[PDB]
């Protein structure tokens, strides 16, 4: 199916009112001018964007003869049967004019014949051209035939067939306003709890298509009936191998008895839980899992945290506020400094606190041995990020992916640098893509990469001060379990001079090992002759005399 | 061209070489000018090479094919050069057409003994397409690169890329035009925008630095709004002149050695 079953597309439905409805339903108007209005409409877009449902929705809204055709169904085993089946499709449409043909998945049979290394395949393409031309000529005046074709790979079509479609409609991924309309059309026959905020649901589904939104509704429905299965398991558990295995066995036993499920409404909490259970089709591959690191894991670094909130977390959460002042929805951050001071840690909190999509690149991970496959990976990297905006791209140890372009530089590694130059700031737009780079050698990064629009801001993450080492040590200790007065003394000790965040974590590890040695020796004495492993202040003394700083030349990275 | 500030000389050369003959082919044919141009835009990064190539592609009302660096390269034998040959076939059949090769040094490096054969066969293919036996009239080629000296010397000859236009750092009075252009398209008045752009802390700023300066000023506005809004709750943002003062302190030029790109 029905015109209400298709939603989120309004420009598309406006065109089809004069390119599909008018030729088929306004037949008399065309006959006044003596004009043969035989039209051909090609629908293309991402898979799941309601191309098949749009064709069937508008095929019941017109009422003319409709011929649904699937491309594999017109293939036969006989020598001439395959081409005869296609011929009968267009012959029946002329006999039933006005009529609407839907050639779904037309790219399966109408592929390029320069690469279709067969005889049937080339004659199938030629038969479609002849069929689409008989419609324009063999139909009576005033009885037009419209051919609808849907394919998510329009580039595979033969150019001699693609030119026969006067109208091409690109059904892209739904926008935020469009996703709200689709959700309403999917839940219009369900019983909702009157508190469903479709504005919030559309805002929390940045990279979803119509099929993905159907899964959210499908997942939310199962939430409502989840409580009606626990009540069913209670009737079976109390009637008479882990718990999940018992459920599959108790329900198997009562395979001849059924209990009516009470009708329930779907609340807003179920919908918000359903969104988390559904992964978008565009998120199936290429995306990393969100790190568990939060701001509670990051001690000190208040200056760094404030810069990352204004540059990334801010515009992601409320882009409306940042748009008014004139800030583009795209940031490029270069974190640099001595090793172990929290560059990767603070970039995993941003990936987690912003609640956006995350892709992490491990240095030169995109390099490939073939000529074009390393630059293609970079181009594909920004295609997935753009399609699932907002997204955070994190390049860990980025100096290995964008080395400074010199004569001595390899030609193959200079193409990757120039590929990233165009992806970050070129002709195409990367709005909604936020890039974070972490490196120890900011001077080994190409100077064109380090410019506003590609990586505008450089944030220096250096060695902690004496006051900062207290915040870091408390953060490390409380996230792994002495009190706090002793931690201040341990962190402020002159033996901790030059310690980084990784050294304080190593200092705590050396304190725990000293605790275990103390436990080992005392346990034997109080078991043979005659406990609780807890890090005492005496254990911290052993660690302070054992752990040495790791950044031995701080000024080598401070430059 | 309303998005482009300063660059008056660069606009004239692009209007005479590309925009001119596209709109009035008869006038340029009369004096004996071939209906095809090759232009190499070079200079330090962030100075507007891609910006003016996007203005030419839009103000000329011609067909546009954009090539983003070495995106034509394929791992199979002959497919990388087939894409280049197919690229010019499309441009010729839809003339007048503008081909923009962004970051062109990645597609036509100098033919050395260490360049391998896969990338040397693409340079030679681009040599024949730009000037060979075949006819490529009606195809206007623009290239942008930060490293003009790393391009093959055969490519940079009259017939393939005849003219090189240097898009360098803005002057003191050019930054005023660029800053006003950036601010006008993203809405302080105009007397204050002159003070910001003429400030000595803006020395060496490119076009991207002035855009970053305006973004830093905008971010400083939201910090001021947050502090005031919280105070009113406890006890329409506009980029004021005090925001530009602290934006001029936290923004540095992104071209450290401009002479290295000259």
């Amino acid at each position: 199916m029905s015109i209400l079953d298709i939603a989120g597309v309004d420009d598309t439905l406006q065109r089809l009112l004069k390119e599909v409805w008018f030729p088929l339903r306004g037949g008399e108007a065309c006959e006044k001018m003596g004009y043969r209005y035989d039209n051909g409409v090609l629908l293309h877009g991402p898979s799941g964007c309601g191309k098949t449902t749009l064709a069937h929705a508008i095929a019941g809204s017109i009422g003319v003869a409709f011929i649904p055709v699937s491309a594999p169904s017109v293939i036969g085993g006989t020598s001439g049967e395959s081409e005869k089946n296609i011929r009968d499709v267009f012959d029946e449409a002329i006999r039933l004019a006005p009529c609407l043909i839907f050639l779904d998945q037309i790219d399966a049979i109408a592929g390029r014949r320069e690469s279709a290394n067969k005889g049937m395949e080339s004659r199938i393409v030629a038969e479609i051209m002849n069929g689409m031309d008989r419609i324009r000529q063999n139909t009576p005046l005033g009885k037009n035939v419209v051919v609808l074709a849907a394919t998510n790979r329009p580039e595979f079509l033969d150019p001699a067939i693609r030119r026969r479609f006067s109208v091409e409609i690109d059904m892209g991924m739904p926008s935020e306003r469009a996703r709200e309309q689709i959700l309403r059309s999917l839940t219009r026959d369900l019983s909702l709890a009157d508190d469903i905020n479709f504005k919030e649901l559309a805002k929390m589904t940045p990279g979803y298509v119509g099929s993905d939104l159907q899964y959210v509704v499908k997942a939310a429905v199962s939430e409502s009936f989840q409580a009606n299965i626990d009540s069913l398991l209670a009737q079976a558990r109390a009637k008479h191998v882990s718990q999940p295995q018992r459920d599959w066995l108790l329900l198997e036993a009562h395979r001849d008895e059924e209990v009516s499920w009470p009708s329930t409404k779907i609340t807003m909490e179920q919908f918000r839980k359903a969104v988390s259970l559904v992964q978008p089709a565009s998120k199936r591959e290429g995306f990393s899992t969100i790190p568990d690191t939060t701001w509670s894991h990051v001690g000190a670094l208040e200056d760094v945290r404030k810069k990352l909130e204004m540059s990334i977390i801010g515009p992601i959460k409320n882009p409306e506020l940042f748009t008014r002042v004139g800030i583009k929805p795209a940031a490029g951050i270069l974190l640099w400094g001595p090793p172990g001071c929290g560059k990767t840690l603070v970039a995993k909190a941003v990936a987690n606190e912003s609640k956006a999509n995350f892709i992490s690149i491990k240095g030169p991970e995109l390099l490939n041995k073939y000529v074009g496959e390393s630059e293609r990976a970079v181009r594909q990297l920004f295609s997935r990020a753009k399609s699932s905006a907002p997204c955070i791209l994190f390049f860990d140890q980025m100096d290995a992916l964008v080395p400074r372009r010199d004569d001595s530089l390899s030609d193959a590694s200079a193409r990757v640098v120039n590929t990233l130059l165009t992806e970050l700031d070129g002709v195409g737009d990367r709005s909604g893509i936020y890039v974070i780079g972490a490196t120890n050698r900011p001077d080994m990064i190409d100077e064109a990469i380090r410019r506003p629009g590609r990586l505008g801001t450089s944030i220096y993450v250096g060695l902690p001060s004496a006051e900062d080492r207290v915040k870091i040590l408390k953060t490390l200790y409380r996230n792994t379990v002495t009190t706090d007065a002793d931690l201040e003394k341990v962190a402020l000790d002159l033996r901790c001079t030059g310690f980084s965040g990784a050294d304080l974590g190593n200092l705590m590890q050396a304190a725990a090992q000293a605790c275990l040695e103390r436990v080992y020796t005392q346990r034997q004495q109080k078991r043979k002759e005659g406990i609780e492993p807890v890090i005492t202040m005496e254990d911290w003394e052993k660690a302070l005399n054992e752990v040495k700083p790791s950044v031995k030349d701080p000024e080598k990275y401070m430059h | 061209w309303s998005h482009v500030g300063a660059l008056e000389d660069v606009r004239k050369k692009l209007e005479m070489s590309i925009i001119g003959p596209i709109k009035n082919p008869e006038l340029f044919t009369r004096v004996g000018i071939k209906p095809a141009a090759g232009i190499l835009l070079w200079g330090p990064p962030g100075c507007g090479k891609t910006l003016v190539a996007k203005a030419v592609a839009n103000e000329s009302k011609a067909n546009f094919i954009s090539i983003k660096g070495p995106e034509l390269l394929n791992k199979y034998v002959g497919e990388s050069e087939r894409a280049v040959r197919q690229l010019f076939s499309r441009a010729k059949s839809s003339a007048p057409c503008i081909l923009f090769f962004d970051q062109m040094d990645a597609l036509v490096p100098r033919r050395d003994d260490s360049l391998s054969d896969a990338s040397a066969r693409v340079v030679n293919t681009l040599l024949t397409e730009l000037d060979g036996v075949g006819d490529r009239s009606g195809i206007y080629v623009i290239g942008a690169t930060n490293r003009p000296d790393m391009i093959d010397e055969a490519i940079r000859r009259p017939g393939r890329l005849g003219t090189s236009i240097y898009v360098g750092l803005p002057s003191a009075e050019d930054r005023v035009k660029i800053l006003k252009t950036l601010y006008r398209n993203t809405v302080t008045t105009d007397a204050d925008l002159e003070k910001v752009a003429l400030d000595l802390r803006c020395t060496g700023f490119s076009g991207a630095d002035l855009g970053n300066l305006m973004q830093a000023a905008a971010q400083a506005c939201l910090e001021r709004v947050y502090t005031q809004r919280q105070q009113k709750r406890k006890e329409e943002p506009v980029i004021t002149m005090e925001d530009w003062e602290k934006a001029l302190n936290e923004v540095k030029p992104s071209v450290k050695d401009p002479e290295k790109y000259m």
């Binding site: 085993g77 041995k369 073939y370 000529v371 390393s374 | 199979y76 391998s116």
Partner: peptide, 24 residues
């Protein structure tokens, strides 16, 4: 007799380009 359309195989064997590395 009836003539039938049959599906078959191919040899193809495309050749791919490679990138190498050199010493100092």
């Amino acid at each position: 007799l009836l003539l039938l359309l049959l599906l078959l195989l191919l040899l193809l064997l495309l050749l791919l380009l490679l990138l190498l590395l050199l010493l100092l």
